[PDB]
Design a protein around this ligand. Structure first.
Ligand SMILES: Nc1ncnc2c1ncn2[C@@H]1O[C@H](CSCC[C@H](N)C(=O)O)[C@@H](O)[C@H]1O
Ligand SMILES: Nc1ncnc2c1ncn2[C@@H]1O[C@H](CSCC[C@H](N)C(=O)O)[C@@H](O)[C@H]1O
Ligand SMILES: Nc1ncnc2c1ncn2[C@@H]1O[C@H](CSCC[C@H](N)C(=O)O)[C@@H](O)[C@H]1O
Ligand SMILES: Nc1ncnc2c1ncn2[C@@H]1O[C@H](CSCC[C@H](N)C(=O)O)[C@@H](O)[C@H]1O
Lengths: 239, 220, 220, 239
């Protein structure tokens, strides 16, 4: 993402899927008043920064990209918030403390192997207080490119091929110009194995919160592919 | 660009399942038809324009819903009985006198069951063209002219042009009380944290400091 | 008791100086680590068992070598790029179907440079429990059961127990060809005159007439 | 060795050093096809018998012990090979012909004086064709008992004391029961003098062929004493 940078924020302000994603993540999070929060794969800090604005006591953001962390620190310096950011690979992260809430919007689909998916979940568990929770947003294991591309919602999925036990997708954000990236679609069974083996005794998959107002304000059938072949899913896990 | 309006109206309506609904100034029927989709038992739409009602009936055929429509002037409306809910999105700002505003509210009251309610969307009495135009949000207000105790505005959708009337809060509340309503509440449009978070900084500043629109709920 | 096996594998490998090496079914890393010691530029080890990989990483710390390890199922392996040498000591006899045998060989081919090679150690297709058990040489074969087109054997090291699959020479050679390899050679274990001279007479008779093990080299 | 006998063969089938010694001697020998071979200090005939199996035309063995020659003749009679054996003191040997190859595995460390070491080399020279060679295995002059005993490789060296210009070691093979013997460690200079004065214009000392496979198949450091304080060495001499 050192080549995307600010083009990711142009995607968040233009993709039809982003309002749904934001609504779903904050639904899963609930009240953040007074909580300590770790925002993993934080990008320029969108979720952590908004979590602080909504009442969190302390927010720490982590991203593997130096460029994104530079933009994240700029936005904090610009808006004058107290977020602290770290450049780290979450799969190989030096311990950073324990938090009420770990938010991971678009972390796990960048695990490039099932081993690294498992490592990431164990790092999340090690980053949680006993009564804390993980809120995540990732690729729905059930997405199939043949059932409909996601370009009209903001992500042009270019291809799909097997990648060990999962699939690899190359893609681009529908921006100007498009910004290319690749991500991984691991199976539901491999996610659930990684969750259980990391010590999360509770999990639940969360369907994106497409609402009646969204259907009413868009052309008929606009959301059909979103409903029948959703690229995205929420996930909540608790120790 | 009606996301905030649509959200606020359905917030004021609440669960409409099984209710009988009268959609006044219905146009091609957008709100009545969506209210049926969300569970209303029966929906009747009224508009003064026969052309709009013809288009509304065409839409109900294209989507197979059981809405019934009538061509009527709400200020001088042939009575239709009592409904659980009267929805009036962009009715009252077409009243061209305080007298007609008052007439409309009495007709709405006469169209409600004693435990029913009015949900309306109208021009905020406190809007002032000098405090900032609304074009960024889809309505360009072209002018502002004194009109007895109120104001008259020419405007355009950003595409078609129209005119409306901005009556004072005092005159609305008097019309509400004199029509027979026991309770009312003004409802600012339901701008939410997610709307501010997903738009450029300060995008909504004029929307909040000089909103053109307001919701209104009245109960017998 | 691995002297003959170790000798034969490094005979098939040849000089590994400066090569990049992928050690499949690596266990605690015995062969990958020794291949590095003999001059390989870079060694990556893969095993399906996270426990084995944890132990492999522990060994590399105890001896200060730069081996990298991954937990992967070779039959369904996340791709790792192309290597000069793939070493697979006791991989293919864990394929539990001909289909999985074929899958493994295609993954190995996909892991090789066009001028690279596979060196493997596996069960000799011609082994037959009736012709003599192997316990004298360190592996007690407990039984022999038909398993579709092949055989399944329970065995023990002489101490721990395991099971493996004995697939036919025809099925190996078909999997080799269908995976894309242009050349293969079966390599009997490199029993040498010095081994016969230093052991009691006829000690190696069963080893030679009914060997459990074979080497195999494949080239793109 | 009239009291050791078959206990020496139990040593050859059990000592860790024996595989190395055998490999090194046959490396020095090379191809024996069609050659005539004299195996001096032959014991029960191990090297001569294996040299015949690998292609030699004719093999003659010599040992000073009547018992060892009896066992050697038994093994030949048992396996049906054509080796011919003689009971002779190599230092005082009646001429026995001239050969392509003289093999002397553990002869020279039984010379009990430098005079007898010299006599043995002259007997070897007199037993060689002009284009022949001597292959020998003997005690490394540089062995020092204080630098590490050899018991873990098969030879428990019990002591070390001066013996004229050299050293005498009493020892035992690690067998059941142990078999005691004594041998002599003559200096490198005295070996090289005996070689030159016998008429060998070429010699080379050969390090035992400890191989990577040997290190890989034994516990770490097992061969450290073998490498730093080797008891054994090869030697090749040519007219
Ligand atoms: N292993 C890893 N550890 C930490 N961050 C990673 C990572 N792999 C990818 N990322 C980061 O994950 C981000 C995906 S974009 C998601 C940005 C942000 N969470 C938002 O939703 O607004 C990129 O910024 C990328 O650099
Ligand atoms: N006195 C009156 N009685 C009934 N309808 C009226 C009216 N004055 C104006 N209208 C109708 O009010 C509508 C305003 S536009 C609003 C249409 C619809 N409620 C919607 O929100 O989509 C027009 O269709 C117009 O014909
Ligand atoms: N499908 C598969 N993919 C990767 N490793 C596998 C596998 N099936 C079995 N294995 C591994 O194969 C190993 C066989 S034991 C051989 C270990 C090592 N090559 C050595 O020679 O010392 C075990 O560690 C086992 O976990
Ligand atoms: N002066 C001498 N002449 C001939 N043989 C001698 C000797 N002194 C000792 N020996 C013999 O040298 C042998 C040493 S043991 C070596 C045996 C054999 N070369 C092998 O390596 O397998 C004994 O058999 C001993 O009897």
């Amino acid at each position: 993402y050192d080549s995307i940078g600010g083009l990711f924020e142009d995607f968040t302000q233009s993709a039809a899927q982003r309002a749904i994603e934001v609504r779903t993540i904050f639904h899963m999070i609930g009240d953040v008043s007074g909580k300590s929060v770790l925002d993993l794969a934080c990008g320029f800090g969108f979720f952590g920064r908004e979590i602080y604005r909504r009442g969190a006591a302390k927010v720490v953001g982590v991203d593997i990209s130096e460029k994104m962390i530079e933009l994240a620190r700029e936005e904090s310096r610009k808006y004058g918030d107290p977020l602290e950011f770290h450049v780290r690979d979450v799969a190989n992260m030096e311990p950073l403390g324990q938090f009420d809430l770990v938010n991971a919007a678009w972390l796990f689909n960048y695990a490039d192997s099932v081993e690294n998916l498992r490592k990431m979940f164990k790092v999340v568990r090690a980053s949680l207080k006993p009564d804390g929770k993980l809120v995540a947003y990732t690729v729905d294991p059930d997405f199939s490119l043949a059932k409909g591309n996601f370009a009209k919602y903001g992500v042009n999925v270019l291809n799909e091929r097997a990648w060990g036990p999962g699939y690899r997708h190359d893609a681009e954000f529908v921006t100007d110009p498009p910004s290319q990236f690749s991500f991984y679609r691991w199976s539901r069974a491999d996610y659930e194995s990684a969750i259980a083996d990391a010590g999360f005794s509770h999990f639940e998959w969360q369907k994106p919160l497409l609402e009646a107002d969204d259907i009413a304000t868009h052309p008929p059938g606009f959301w059909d592919v979103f409903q029948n072949n959703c690229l995205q899913t929420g996930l909540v896990c608790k120790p």
